[PDB]
Symmetry: D2
Subunit: 194 residues, 4 copies
């Protein structure tokens, strides 16, 4: 089964989370995992002025989403919605919609916030779009503690706190939940698709 | 795989929908389908005064939800939320929550409204609760037309219009979508659980 | 202007928050504030088995909601929705709905939760209902903190009591809503 | 009171609705109404390839939103969210957010959709953002019809134009919001 971790990050928090999701997914024998980012929509001059972080991941096209059995979407919280960059990218999936290209495929979502507020709304409003595509939506609930690789309130998807100033980095507790999410979704993908 | 169609109905619209969901689910070889209702919370005197409809389905207990591989929830729209009866029943699932009893099981939702407004919100706010339980959420999207048994804008779950006066009954077009939802969810249940 | 603080509480957390909301609203000249609860739907036997804290505020009827200029609704988070008790109560407001009785009145929401998340969804899914009644919805913005409404964290075991800061935010919500009610209604 | 009707439209449906909203708002004595659009983010080449209807209303800056007493936001339904263009625009209001510039101002939302559903989710997920800014949210209630805000059905092929009834509801939304803006701000 093929698993895509598709993300947008301005300052690297979601990028670090994406790498954790991919790490967990890679634990599943038979899962082929790929990490890509959506295009930055800001001119590079403005992105650099704003202290945006450069990233090694390849840029996804909308059309290539059709190639995967599961897609795990990562976005920062922007006033309780997904980012404009992710929204703009998803608005380019009308062709896939019309052909049924994503119907029945697995989808799951992770996020990041400065100070917590809005994270739930970001995830559930992303689910809405995934449902228009007919995707099967995978929340994380509160999984059995022994399934997390770090011993230790986010049932919709993994999250991390960036701090009011953006300077906080994901903790190992937060990354462990992201790794669980990837492993769990990839396992489902293999169970459904081989 | 065992599939529960669990519903609340005051005037029979959701009951008719539930029967359609169950009919579709029953098409799947290997799916064992059962239909139950949540308890009425109104005293019978008031229910009868209000013109409520008597129903043959057995009354579910909260604990028995643990016995199923998939649960398809039906509720009328009450100001854009599930009914009080369904909410009250789900509030009795704390024990299941604590034990992980519903984690990873399939869930899907159908509804009914008088005049359309609120149906989307009813379904997505029901999804929230299912996600706290760790259930895998199955929207219906816009499925391939040849999969509906009646040739013919509801991607979250099947719906029906009861009319402002409650006198409209589900059309065959609406029931066909409910039947598709049951068949689709039961197929997934068998693919995951045998 | 008349302000109703209308709440459901099983273990007392929302009850404590409701008192704070009312205190804040009472700081506003011209605001007449009343605190009521929705009925418990559980038989007392089952409420007591569950370790409930018996509520003694006056019980509101669904119909009296029409008498207020602003209503501030309190509910615990129950798997990211309002409680069944609050939902059952609101399901009895169909008569008001039909008559337009709450149309244009102010509404605002506060909640309580354990440490599991869901509070944001509880508040926003409560807003949906208020909108069907045509109520004007008042979030708190950036005045487990959300801009949607005041919250308190009760702890996984329910033993935490609202913090000083959480009660201050609840007081602010009452004061702010009551002020808007007076600006609109005198 | 100053009322901004701020919209995004690709094929003209929200543009037509915005004109109606503005007409309604303009019926209110003391309301000063302005209609602006958010920038198109697509290069014109791609907008034209997609059959877009070139928009000519003045383009709003994110910062000028602070100048209004009420803002009525229009966006097409894009898989149950606002459009990427409206989202990109709102993502540029962080400077206002930090300064509290929109706090307490009135907000209301209208939308357009094909026949697929999602309009309710578009409106309510737009409300979330408005709440982060501390805006007071105005649904229309029972004054593809929703109590959340005016809508129009564009058809599966986009060829339907707003109906007379849909434009009447849009006018009502503008009139109602503008009236509340004048009651609050003169
Ligand atoms: C326009 C804008 C809106 C924001 N809205 C929120 C918010 O609603 N809640 C929050 O806690 N943080 C908010 N933030 C902080 C971002 O979520 C934070 O920068 C992001 O999670 C960092 O992830 P990244 O490094 O992957 O870009 C916002 C930031 C911006 C620029
Ligand atoms: C308290 C209450 C609230 C309602 N809210 C809505 C609503 O938000 N939207 C709507 O279109 N119909 C609404 N209705 C109509 C119900 O959805 C309708 O009675 C129901 O779908 C019938 O299903 P049933 O026969 O299975 O009970 C409401 C009815 C009641 C009693
Ligand atoms: C049925 C049920 C569901 C609950 N769901 C959640 C939840 O989704 N998230 C959460 O953090 N706490 C949850 N809780 C814990 C309650 O929110 C907490 O006990 C409640 O806020 C107490 O408020 P009260 O003392 O006013 O009743 C739940 C509790 C019950 C009984
Ligand atoms: C990316 C995209 C997603 C869409 N999603 C939906 C949808 O979820 N439901 C719907 O009924 N129509 C949907 N539509 C159709 C639009 O809502 C319709 O073309 C739009 O309302 C037109 O408004 P405008 O003319 O102002 O651009 C979508 C269109 C596009 C381009
Ligand atoms: O979903 C939840 C249920 C109960 C609780 O305490 C926390 C979260
Ligand atoms: O919001 C609504 C309430 C009741 C009804 O019948 C239709 C809509
Ligand atoms: O989800 C949808 C996408 C496009 C459209 O036209 C209708 C619905
Ligand atoms: O709503 C919010 C916006 C920005 C931020 O940094 C934190 C919260």
């Amino acid at each position: 089964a093929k698993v895509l971790v598709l993300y947008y990050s301005m300052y690297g928090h979601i990028e670090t989370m994406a790498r954790a999701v991919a790490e967990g997914a890679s634990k599943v024998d038979g899962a082929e995992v790929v990490v890509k980012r959506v295009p930055e929509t800001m001119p590079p001059q403005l992105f650099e002025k704003a202290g945006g972080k450069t990233q090694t991941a390849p840029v996804a096209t909308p059309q290539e989403l059709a190639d995967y059995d599961a897609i795990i979407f990562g976005t920062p919280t922007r006033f309780g919605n997904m980012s404009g960059q992710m929204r703009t990218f998803l608005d380019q999936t009308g062709g896939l919609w019309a052909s049924g290209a994503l119907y029945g495929k697995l989808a799951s979502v992770f996020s990041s916030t400065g100070t917590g507020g809005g994270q739930e709304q970001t995830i559930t409003s992303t689910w809405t779009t995934l449902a228009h595509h007919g995707m099967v939506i995978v929340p994380i609930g509160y999984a059995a503690q022994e399934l997390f690789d770090v011993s230790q309130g986010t049932p919709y998807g993994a999250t991390t706190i960036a701090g009011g100033d953006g300077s906080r980095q994901p903790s190992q507790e937060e990354l462990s939940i992201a790794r669980y999410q990837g492993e769990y979704v990839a396992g489902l993908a293999v169970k459904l698709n081989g």
